[PDB]
Subunit: 116 residues, 4 copies
Protein backbone atom coordinates (compact mmCIF):
# COMPACT_ATOMS: atom_id res chain seq x y z
CA UNK A 1 0.00 0.00 0.00
CA UNK A 2 1.25 3.48 -0.87
CA UNK A 3 -0.26 4.96 2.30
CA UNK A 4 0.27 3.71 5.86
CA UNK A 5 -0.50 5.36 9.19
CA UNK A 6 1.37 4.51 12.41
CA UNK A 7 0.30 5.96 15.75
CA UNK A 8 2.14 5.83 19.08
CA UNK A 9 1.06 6.78 22.63
CA UNK A 10 3.70 8.90 24.40
CA UNK A 11 2.12 8.43 27.84
CA UNK A 12 2.16 4.65 27.90
CA UNK A 13 5.07 4.03 25.48
CA UNK A 14 2.94 1.82 23.32
CA UNK A 15 1.24 1.67 19.96
CA UNK A 16 -2.06 3.57 19.98
CA UNK A 17 -4.57 0.81 19.33
CA UNK A 18 -8.05 1.10 17.74
CA UNK A 19 -7.57 4.73 16.70
CA UNK A 20 -10.02 5.75 13.96
CA UNK A 21 -8.45 7.34 10.89
CA UNK A 22 -10.36 9.10 8.07
CA UNK A 23 -8.73 10.08 4.78
CA UNK A 24 -10.11 12.74 2.42
CA UNK A 25 -8.99 14.02 -0.98
CA UNK A 26 -9.59 17.54 -2.22
CA UNK A 27 -11.92 17.57 -5.23
CA UNK A 28 -11.76 19.81 -8.32
CA UNK A 29 -14.37 22.07 -6.66
CA UNK A 30 -12.20 22.47 -3.53
CA UNK A 31 -14.35 20.31 -1.22
CA UNK A 32 -13.02 17.37 0.89
CA UNK A 33 -14.27 14.09 -0.57
CA UNK A 34 -14.14 10.94 1.62
CA UNK A 35 -11.27 8.75 0.32
CA UNK A 36 -10.78 5.92 2.84
CA UNK A 37 -10.96 5.07 6.52
CA UNK A 38 -9.90 2.48 9.04
CA UNK A 39 -8.60 1.94 12.53
CA UNK A 40 -5.20 1.15 13.89
CA UNK A 41 -4.28 -2.41 14.77
CA UNK A 42 -2.64 -3.84 17.91
CA UNK A 43 0.67 -2.57 16.48
CA UNK A 44 -0.78 0.94 16.06
CA UNK A 45 -0.65 0.55 12.26
CA UNK A 46 -3.27 1.00 9.56
CA UNK A 47 -2.52 -0.69 6.26
CA UNK A 48 -4.59 -1.22 3.12
CA UNK A 49 -6.22 2.24 2.94
CA UNK A 50 -5.60 2.51 -0.77
CA UNK A 51 -3.92 1.21 -3.87
CA UNK A 52 -1.39 2.43 -6.37
CA UNK A 53 -4.13 2.85 -8.94
CA UNK A 54 -6.43 4.82 -6.76
CA UNK A 55 -3.91 7.01 -5.00
CA UNK A 56 -3.43 9.53 -7.72
CA UNK A 57 -1.92 13.03 -7.42
CA UNK A 58 -3.91 15.30 -5.13
CA UNK A 59 -4.16 17.04 -1.79
CA UNK A 60 -4.98 14.53 0.94
CA UNK A 61 -6.09 14.92 4.51
CA UNK A 62 -5.52 12.26 7.13
CA UNK A 63 -7.62 12.91 10.20
CA UNK A 64 -6.69 10.82 13.21
CA UNK A 65 -9.38 10.64 15.93
CA UNK A 66 -7.13 11.29 18.88
CA UNK A 67 -9.92 12.72 21.06
CA UNK A 68 -11.86 9.41 21.13
CA UNK A 69 -8.61 7.58 21.90
CA UNK A 70 -7.88 9.68 24.98
CA UNK A 71 -11.51 9.77 26.14
CA UNK A 72 -11.61 5.96 26.19
CA UNK A 73 -8.61 6.05 28.55
CA UNK A 74 -10.44 8.52 30.85
CA UNK A 75 -8.52 11.56 29.61
CA UNK A 76 -10.01 14.84 28.30
CA UNK A 77 -7.41 15.88 25.73
CA UNK A 78 -6.78 19.22 24.14
CA UNK A 79 -7.13 18.44 20.44
CA UNK A 80 -10.24 17.28 18.61
CA UNK A 81 -8.01 15.27 16.28
CA UNK A 82 -4.69 15.32 14.51
CA UNK A 83 -5.11 16.28 10.85
CA UNK A 84 -2.22 15.92 8.44
CA UNK A 85 -2.70 17.62 5.05
CA UNK A 86 -0.33 17.13 2.15
CA UNK A 87 0.14 17.02 -1.60
CA UNK A 88 0.85 13.46 -2.72
CA UNK A 89 2.53 12.00 -5.81
CA UNK A 90 3.38 15.31 -7.44
CA UNK A 91 6.77 14.05 -8.71
CA UNK A 92 5.45 10.55 -9.34
CA UNK A 93 4.13 7.73 -7.18
CA UNK A 94 5.60 7.44 -3.70
CA UNK A 95 4.95 5.42 -0.57
CA UNK A 96 3.92 7.50 2.45
CA UNK A 97 4.06 6.56 6.09
CA UNK A 98 2.30 9.08 8.30
CA UNK A 99 3.64 8.69 11.82
CA UNK A 100 1.88 10.36 14.76
CA UNK A 101 2.99 10.56 18.39
CA UNK A 102 0.19 11.38 20.82
CA UNK A 103 0.03 13.06 24.25
CA UNK A 104 -3.07 14.54 25.86
CA UNK A 105 -2.03 18.15 25.14
CA UNK A 106 0.43 17.60 22.26
CA UNK A 107 1.00 15.64 19.12
CA UNK A 108 3.70 15.38 16.54
CA UNK A 109 3.48 14.04 13.10
CA UNK A 110 6.11 13.06 10.60
CA UNK A 111 6.10 11.72 7.05
CA UNK A 112 8.44 9.08 5.71
CA UNK A 113 8.30 9.25 1.95
CA UNK A 114 10.01 6.59 -0.13
CA UNK A 115 10.35 5.82 -3.82
CA UNK A 116 8.87 2.31 -4.43
Amino acid sequence: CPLMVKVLDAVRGSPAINVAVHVFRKAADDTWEPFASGKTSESGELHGLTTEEEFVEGIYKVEIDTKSYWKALGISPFHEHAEVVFTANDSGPRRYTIAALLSPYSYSTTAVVTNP
Copy 2:
Protein backbone atom coordinates in the same frame (compact mmCIF):
# COMPACT_ATOMS: atom_id res chain seq x y z
CA CYS B 1 -5.12 37.83 25.17
CA PRO B 2 -6.85 34.48 25.69
CA LEU B 3 -5.08 33.02 22.63
CA MET B 4 -1.43 33.30 21.60
CA VAL B 5 0.51 31.35 18.99
CA LYS B 6 4.27 30.72 19.16
CA VAL B 7 6.14 29.08 16.27
CA LEU B 8 9.72 27.74 16.20
CA ASP B 9 11.89 26.58 13.30
CA ALA B 10 13.75 23.33 14.03
CA VAL B 11 16.03 23.68 10.97
CA ARG B 12 17.39 27.16 11.71
CA GLY B 13 16.98 27.03 15.52
CA SER B 14 15.04 30.24 15.55
CA PRO B 15 11.58 31.69 15.93
CA ALA B 16 9.58 31.17 12.74
CA ILE B 17 9.08 34.71 11.53
CA ASN B 18 6.36 36.07 9.23
CA VAL B 19 4.32 32.87 9.29
CA ALA B 20 0.67 33.46 8.38
CA VAL B 21 -1.81 32.10 10.91
CA HIS B 22 -5.61 31.91 10.45
CA VAL B 23 -8.13 31.15 13.18
CA PHE B 24 -11.58 29.75 12.46
CA ARG B 25 -14.59 28.93 14.61
CA LYS B 26 -16.87 26.00 13.78
CA ALA B 27 -20.30 27.26 12.76
CA ALA B 28 -23.64 25.62 13.48
CA ASP B 29 -23.65 24.11 9.96
CA ASP B 30 -20.21 22.50 10.62
CA THR B 31 -18.37 24.89 8.29
CA TRP B 32 -15.31 26.84 9.40
CA GLU B 33 -15.90 30.56 9.76
CA PRO B 34 -12.80 32.82 9.61
CA PHE B 35 -12.39 34.51 12.97
CA ALA B 36 -8.93 36.16 13.11
CA SER B 37 -5.52 36.05 11.48
CA GLY B 38 -2.01 37.52 11.62
CA LYS B 39 1.65 36.86 10.92
CA THR B 40 4.17 35.82 13.56
CA SER B 41 6.57 38.48 14.84
CA GLU B 42 10.38 38.51 14.93
CA SER B 43 10.00 36.40 18.09
CA GLY B 44 7.72 33.89 16.33
CA GLU B 45 4.72 35.13 18.27
CA LEU B 46 1.23 36.18 17.36
CA HIS B 47 -0.72 38.09 19.98
CA GLY B 48 -4.00 39.97 19.97
CA LEU B 49 -6.02 37.53 17.85
CA THR B 50 -9.08 37.74 20.06
CA THR B 51 -10.50 39.14 23.30
CA GLU B 52 -11.88 37.46 26.39
CA GLU B 53 -15.42 38.62 25.42
CA GLU B 54 -15.25 37.30 21.88
CA PHE B 55 -13.51 34.01 22.58
CA VAL B 56 -16.56 32.08 23.78
CA GLU B 57 -16.81 28.28 24.12
CA GLY B 58 -16.75 26.54 20.74
CA ILE B 59 -14.54 24.51 18.47
CA TYR B 60 -11.64 26.47 17.00
CA LYS B 61 -9.10 25.76 14.28
CA VAL B 62 -5.70 27.42 14.12
CA GLU B 63 -4.17 26.98 10.67
CA ILE B 64 -0.46 27.76 10.40
CA ASP B 65 0.79 28.32 6.84
CA THR B 66 3.92 26.20 7.09
CA LYS B 67 4.15 25.59 3.37
CA SER B 68 4.64 29.30 2.51
CA TYR B 69 7.23 29.53 5.27
CA TRP B 70 9.34 26.65 3.90
CA LYS B 71 8.84 27.97 0.35
CA ALA B 72 10.24 31.36 1.48
CA LEU B 73 13.35 29.50 2.76
CA GLY B 74 13.82 27.42 -0.42
CA ILE B 75 13.21 24.15 1.40
CA SER B 76 10.76 21.49 0.08
CA PRO B 77 7.99 20.90 2.61
CA PHE B 78 5.61 18.01 3.15
CA HIS B 79 2.50 19.55 4.72
CA GLU B 80 0.14 22.10 3.20
CA HIS B 81 -0.14 23.59 6.66
CA ALA B 82 -0.36 22.65 10.29
CA GLU B 83 -3.92 22.67 11.67
CA VAL B 84 -4.63 22.68 15.37
CA VAL B 85 -8.26 21.97 16.27
CA PHE B 86 -9.61 22.24 19.78
CA THR B 87 -12.59 22.94 21.99
CA ALA B 88 -12.22 26.11 24.06
CA ASN B 89 -13.73 25.54 27.49
CA ASP B 90 -14.79 27.92 30.20
CA SER B 91 -14.38 25.73 33.32
CA GLY B 92 -10.71 25.22 32.88
CA PRO B 93 -7.86 27.64 32.72
CA ARG B 94 -8.46 29.76 29.77
CA ARG B 95 -5.36 31.44 28.41
CA TYR B 96 -4.19 29.26 25.53
CA THR B 97 -0.74 29.26 24.01
CA ILE B 98 -0.50 27.13 20.88
CA ALA B 99 3.16 26.24 20.50
CA ALA B 100 4.31 24.73 17.22
CA LEU B 101 7.69 23.34 16.24
CA LEU B 102 8.31 23.14 12.51
CA SER B 103 10.46 20.91 10.34
CA PRO B 104 10.07 20.42 6.59
CA TYR B 105 8.60 16.88 6.98
CA SER B 106 7.37 17.04 10.58
CA TYR B 107 5.64 19.31 13.06
CA SER B 108 4.57 19.12 16.66
CA THR B 109 2.07 21.20 18.42
CA THR B 110 1.30 21.59 22.09
CA ALA B 111 -1.15 23.61 24.10
CA VAL B 112 -0.11 25.49 27.22
CA VAL B 113 -3.35 26.21 29.07
CA THR B 114 -3.03 28.37 32.17
CA ASN B 115 -4.78 30.38 34.99
Copy 3:
Protein backbone atom coordinates in the same frame (compact mmCIF):
# COMPACT_ATOMS: atom_id res chain seq x y z
CA CYS C 1 21.32 35.61 30.35
CA PRO C 2 23.06 33.71 27.55
CA LEU C 3 21.30 30.47 28.56
CA MET C 4 17.65 29.90 29.46
CA VAL C 5 15.71 26.66 29.82
CA LYS C 6 11.96 26.34 29.24
CA VAL C 7 10.10 23.11 30.01
CA LEU C 8 6.52 22.14 29.07
CA ASP C 9 4.35 19.21 30.20
CA ALA C 10 2.50 17.54 27.32
CA VAL C 11 0.22 15.53 29.65
CA ARG C 12 -1.15 18.44 31.70
CA GLY C 13 -0.74 21.14 29.01
CA SER C 14 1.19 23.36 31.34
CA PRO C 15 4.64 24.63 32.15
CA ALA C 16 6.65 21.94 33.93
CA ILE C 17 7.14 23.47 37.35
CA ASN C 18 9.86 22.71 39.92
CA VAL C 19 11.91 20.58 37.54
CA ALA C 20 15.56 20.33 38.59
CA VAL C 21 18.04 21.26 35.87
CA HIS C 22 21.84 20.81 36.05
CA VAL C 23 24.36 22.29 33.64
CA PHE C 24 27.82 20.82 33.11
CA ARG C 25 30.83 21.83 31.05
CA LYS C 26 33.11 19.24 29.47
CA ALA C 27 36.54 19.36 31.09
CA ALA C 28 39.88 18.78 29.40
CA ASP C 29 39.90 15.17 30.70
CA ASP C 30 36.46 14.55 29.06
CA THR C 31 34.62 14.46 32.40
CA TRP C 32 31.55 16.60 33.06
CA GLU C 33 32.14 19.40 35.55
CA PRO C 34 29.03 20.82 37.30
CA PHE C 35 28.62 24.44 36.25
CA ALA C 36 25.15 25.65 37.35
CA SER C 37 21.74 24.38 38.38
CA GLY C 38 18.23 25.47 39.36
CA LYS C 39 14.57 24.50 39.35
CA THR C 40 12.05 25.72 36.79
CA SER C 41 9.64 28.47 37.85
CA GLU C 42 5.84 28.55 37.81
CA SER C 43 6.21 29.42 34.12
CA GLY C 44 8.50 26.43 33.48
CA GLU C 45 11.50 28.69 33.07
CA LEU C 46 14.98 28.75 34.46
CA HIS C 47 16.93 31.98 34.07
CA GLY C 48 20.21 33.26 35.46
CA LEU C 49 22.23 30.05 35.12
CA THR C 50 25.29 31.82 33.77
CA THR C 51 26.70 35.15 32.59
CA GLU C 52 28.08 36.26 29.26
CA GLU C 53 31.62 36.36 30.77
CA GLU C 54 31.46 32.86 32.21
CA PHE C 55 29.73 31.13 29.33
CA VAL C 56 32.78 30.70 27.10
CA GLU C 57 33.04 28.36 24.09
CA GLY C 58 32.98 24.70 25.12
CA ILE C 59 30.78 21.64 25.18
CA TYR C 60 27.88 21.90 27.61
CA LYS C 61 25.34 19.42 28.94
CA VAL C 62 21.94 20.42 30.27
CA GLU C 63 20.41 17.60 32.30
CA ILE C 64 16.70 17.93 33.04
CA ASP C 65 15.46 15.70 35.88
CA THR C 66 12.33 14.44 34.16
CA LYS C 67 12.10 11.29 36.24
CA SER C 68 11.61 13.19 39.55
CA TYR C 69 9.01 15.36 37.83
CA TRP C 70 6.91 12.39 36.66
CA LYS C 71 7.41 10.70 40.04
CA ALA C 72 6.00 13.83 41.75
CA LEU C 73 2.90 13.49 39.52
CA GLY C 74 2.43 9.75 40.16
CA ILE C 75 3.05 8.85 36.52
CA SER C 76 5.51 6.08 35.47
CA PRO C 77 8.28 7.54 33.33
CA PHE C 78 10.66 5.97 30.85
CA HIS C 79 13.76 8.17 30.91
CA GLU C 80 16.12 8.80 33.81
CA HIS C 81 16.40 12.35 32.54
CA ALA C 82 16.61 14.37 29.38
CA GLU C 83 20.17 15.39 28.46
CA VAL C 84 20.87 18.11 25.95
CA VAL C 85 24.51 18.30 24.81
CA PHE C 86 25.85 21.04 22.62
CA THR C 87 28.83 23.15 21.63
CA ALA C 88 28.46 26.82 22.54
CA ASN C 89 29.96 28.95 19.78
CA ASP C 90 31.01 32.55 19.68
CA SER C 91 30.61 33.35 15.96
CA GLY C 92 26.93 32.67 15.88
CA PRO C 93 24.08 34.20 17.75
CA ARG C 94 24.68 33.49 21.32
CA ARG C 95 21.58 33.63 23.47
CA TYR C 96 20.42 30.03 23.84
CA THR C 97 16.97 28.91 24.86
CA ILE C 98 16.74 25.16 25.44
CA ALA C 99 13.07 24.27 25.04
CA ALA C 100 11.93 20.84 26.18
CA LEU C 101 8.55 19.17 25.82
CA LEU C 102 7.94 16.31 28.21
CA SER C 103 5.80 13.19 28.06
CA PRO C 104 6.19 10.12 30.26
CA TYR C 105 7.66 7.99 27.41
CA SER C 106 8.90 10.74 25.07
CA TYR C 107 10.61 14.10 25.04
CA SER C 108 11.69 16.61 22.45
CA THR C 109 14.18 19.32 22.78
CA THR C 110 14.94 22.28 20.56
CA ALA C 111 17.39 25.13 20.67
CA VAL C 112 16.34 28.69 19.92
CA VAL C 113 19.58 30.54 19.19
CA THR C 114 19.25 34.28 18.66
CA ASN C 115 21.00 37.72 18.21
Copy 4:
Protein backbone atom coordinates in the same frame (compact mmCIF):
# COMPACT_ATOMS: atom_id res chain seq x y z
CA CYS D 1 16.31 -8.60 19.82
CA PRO D 2 15.05 -6.87 22.96
CA LEU D 3 16.56 -3.54 21.88
CA MET D 4 16.02 -1.79 18.55
CA VAL D 5 16.79 1.78 17.48
CA LYS D 6 14.92 3.55 14.66
CA VAL D 7 15.99 6.98 13.45
CA LEU D 8 14.14 9.33 11.08
CA ASP D 9 15.22 12.58 9.36
CA ALA D 10 12.57 15.31 9.70
CA VAL D 11 14.15 17.51 7.02
CA ARG D 12 14.12 14.98 4.20
CA GLY D 13 11.20 12.78 5.40
CA SER D 14 13.34 9.69 5.26
CA PRO D 15 15.05 7.14 7.43
CA ALA D 16 18.34 8.45 8.82
CA ILE D 17 20.86 6.10 7.24
CA ASN D 18 24.34 5.14 8.54
CA VAL D 19 23.86 6.86 11.91
CA ALA D 20 26.31 5.55 14.52
CA VAL D 21 24.74 4.38 17.78
CA HIS D 22 26.64 3.53 20.99
CA VAL D 23 25.01 1.79 23.94
CA PHE D 24 26.40 1.87 27.50
CA ARG D 25 25.27 0.25 30.76
CA LYS D 26 25.87 1.75 34.18
CA ALA D 27 28.20 -0.43 36.26
CA ALA D 28 28.04 -1.17 40.00
CA ASP D 29 30.64 1.59 40.52
CA ASP D 30 28.46 4.16 38.68
CA THR D 31 30.62 4.38 35.52
CA TRP D 32 29.29 3.91 31.94
CA GLU D 33 30.55 0.61 30.53
CA PRO D 34 30.42 0.06 26.73
CA PHE D 35 27.56 -2.38 26.02
CA ALA D 36 27.08 -2.47 22.23
CA SER D 37 27.25 -0.36 19.10
CA GLY D 38 26.20 -0.27 15.48
CA LYS D 39 24.89 1.90 12.71
CA THR D 40 21.49 2.36 11.20
CA SER D 41 20.58 0.57 7.99
CA GLU D 42 18.94 1.89 4.81
CA SER D 43 15.64 1.70 6.71
CA GLY D 44 17.07 3.79 9.56
CA GLU D 45 16.95 0.74 11.87
CA LEU D 46 19.57 -0.91 14.04
CA HIS D 47 18.83 -4.49 15.05
CA GLY D 48 20.90 -7.14 16.80
CA LEU D 49 22.52 -4.91 19.46
CA THR D 50 21.91 -7.44 22.18
CA THR D 51 20.23 -10.60 23.35
CA GLU D 52 17.70 -11.61 25.94
CA GLU D 53 20.44 -13.20 28.00
CA GLU D 54 22.74 -10.25 27.96
CA PHE D 55 20.21 -7.47 28.36
CA VAL D 56 19.73 -7.75 32.06
CA GLU D 57 18.21 -5.15 34.42
CA GLY D 58 20.19 -1.92 34.51
CA ILE D 59 20.43 1.70 33.51
CA TYR D 60 21.25 2.00 29.82
CA LYS D 61 22.37 4.88 27.67
CA VAL D 62 21.80 4.98 23.94
CA GLU D 63 23.89 7.68 22.33
CA ILE D 64 22.97 8.45 18.74
CA ASP D 65 25.65 10.33 16.76
CA THR D 66 23.39 12.92 15.22
CA LYS D 67 26.18 15.50 14.78
CA SER D 68 28.13 13.30 12.31
CA TYR D 69 24.89 12.61 10.45
CA TRP D 70 24.15 16.29 9.88
CA LYS D 71 27.77 17.21 9.17
CA ALA D 72 27.88 14.65 6.35
CA LEU D 73 24.88 16.43 4.80
CA GLY D 74 26.70 19.80 5.04
CA ILE D 75 24.77 20.96 8.10
CA SER D 76 26.27 22.24 11.40
CA PRO D 77 23.66 21.06 13.91
CA PHE D 78 23.03 22.18 17.44
CA HIS D 79 23.38 18.94 19.39
CA GLU D 80 26.50 16.81 19.79
CA HIS D 81 24.28 13.73 19.90
CA ALA D 82 20.95 12.46 21.15
CA GLU D 83 21.38 10.44 24.34
CA VAL D 84 18.49 8.42 25.72
CA VAL D 85 18.97 7.10 29.27
CA PHE D 86 16.60 4.64 30.89
CA THR D 87 16.14 1.82 33.37
CA ALA D 88 15.43 -1.42 31.53
CA ASN D 89 13.76 -4.68 32.56
CA ASP D 90 12.91 -3.62 36.09
CA SER D 91 9.52 -5.42 36.04
CA GLY D 92 10.85 -8.26 33.90
CA PRO D 93 12.17 -8.59 30.36
CA ARG D 94 10.69 -6.25 27.78
CA ARG D 95 11.35 -5.34 24.17
CA TYR D 96 12.37 -1.71 23.63
CA THR D 97 12.23 0.32 20.47
CA ILE D 98 13.98 3.66 20.81
CA ALA D 99 12.64 5.96 18.12
CA ALA D 100 14.40 9.25 17.34
CA LEU D 101 13.28 12.05 15.02
CA LEU D 102 16.07 14.39 13.96
CA SER D 103 16.23 18.04 12.85
CA PRO D 104 19.32 20.24 12.83
CA TYR D 105 18.27 22.17 15.97
CA SER D 106 15.82 19.69 17.53
CA TYR D 107 15.26 16.04 18.23
CA SER D 108 12.56 13.97 19.80
CA THR D 109 12.79 10.54 21.17
CA THR D 110 10.17 8.04 22.15
CA ALA D 111 10.18 4.53 23.58
CA VAL D 112 7.85 1.75 22.56
CA VAL D 113 7.99 -0.89 25.25
CA THR D 114 6.28 -4.23 24.73
CA ASN D 115 5.95 -7.45 26.67
CA PRO D 116 7.44 -10.29 24.52
